[PDB]
Amino acid sequence: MAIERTLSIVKPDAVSKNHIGEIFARFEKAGLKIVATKMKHLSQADAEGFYAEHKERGFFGDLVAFMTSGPVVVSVLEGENAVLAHREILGATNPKEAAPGTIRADFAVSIDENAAHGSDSVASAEREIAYFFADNEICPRTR
Amino acid sequence: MAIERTLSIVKPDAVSKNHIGEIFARFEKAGLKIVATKMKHLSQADAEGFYAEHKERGFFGDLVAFMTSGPVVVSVLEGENAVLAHREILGATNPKEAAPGTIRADFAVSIDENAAHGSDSVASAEREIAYFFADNEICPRTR
């Protein structure tokens, strides 16, 4: 259908075990294009701001701790049906419920340590992308 | 077996052909760790500054034009013997002279569009890394 952009995060687990390349390759093989990317070590404030909607939930602290335990790679992916297609390759949030051959199935150890993040929707994608990237930071493909 | 850092650039050809993941994976498979990375679209000044040592060369204009023709990915790779090790997996600058299985052999179409850059020495690596990255930008692995 229409060209969408979605946020990817390779989480501290997948980075520490050096799966950045393999994961990126999954994106690109499925036809998604990386139009922005950067490695970051999120501060407590960064993670808390990003996951702000879950501020009152029981798992908030766990989530913040895991996402600040080490450097991540934050990326913007562009393509047809990007949000859902990205979601398909990632697999279920729960790696034990994730289908074989997906990123979570292949690289995730647990719920907390589930390798990668992807935006849940187009609406969530715009906010998440805007959280990590200035609009002039997202590089159109020339060439 | 002393740990070094070297600069990697995925050039606009390999980026436009969506080989970022595959190339990254080659790095990680070789025991190198990605400790910094970002996608950038180099300005003419950016490119001219980085390649300043070739300013007087005839091919300078072609080099700058190609390296500004589209987005690149600049990265810092870390590991034992990183400079030389990176150059081994990259292969010869000329893809016709590159060994099988190297990045240039697999992803380069020509000498001009040869997929990727790697620092040629420790002195140049220290300069190239500092050109694109603040020390505070290079993320040590904490897990």
For the question of residue B19 being annotated catalytic, the response is no
The whole-angstrom distance between B140's CA and the closest CA on chain A is 8
Which one, of A11, A7, A62, A8, lies nearest residue A41 by Cα? A11
Asked if residues B20 and A8 have their Cβ atoms less than 8 Å apart, the reply is: no
Q: Could B141 and A16 be called an inter-chain contact, meaning their C-beta atoms sit closer than 8 Å?
A: yes
A87 known member of a binding site: yes
Structure resolution, Å: 1.9
B112 known member of a binding site: yes
Distance CA A20, CA A141 (A): 21
Looking at the structure of chain B, the number of domains it has is 1
CB neighbour list of residue A143: distance below 8 Å, 6 or more residues apart: B12, B13, B15, B16, B69, B70, B71
Tokens of B17: 């052909």
- In DSSP terms, B94 is beta-bridged to none
Q: What are the Cα distances from residue A105, in Å, to A21, A85, A90, A108, A113? A: 16, 16, 8, 6, 12
Distance CA B8, CA B31 (A): 15
Distance CA B35, CA B78 (A): 7
Residues of A in Cβ contact (< 8 Å) with B40: 139
DSSP string, A74-134: EEEEEEETHHHHHHHHH--SSTTTSPTTSHHHHH--SSSS-SEEE-SSHHHHHHHHHHH--
Report which DSSP code applies to B54. Answer: G
β-pair type (B3-10, A33-40): unpaired
Closest in B18, B139, B141 to A33, CB measured:
B18
Residue located via tokens 């400079």: B83
Tokens of B135: 């020390």
DSSP string, B48-87: HHHTGGGTTSTTHHHHHHHHTSS-EEEEEEEEETHHHHHH
- Most B CBs within 10 Å, among A11, A18, A23, to test the B interface: A18
Distance CA B125, CA A57 (A): 46
Range of the domain at B71: 1-143
Residue B84 belongs to domain with CATH number: 3.30.70.141
Breakpoints of chain B, after residues (C–N > 2.5 Å): none
Report which DSSP code applies to B139. Answer: -
Tokens of B57: 């060369």
3-class secondary structure, A16: helix
Asked if residues A25 and B22 have their Cβ atoms less than 8 Å apart, the reply is: yes
- How far, in whole angstroms, is CA A133 from its chain's centroid? 13
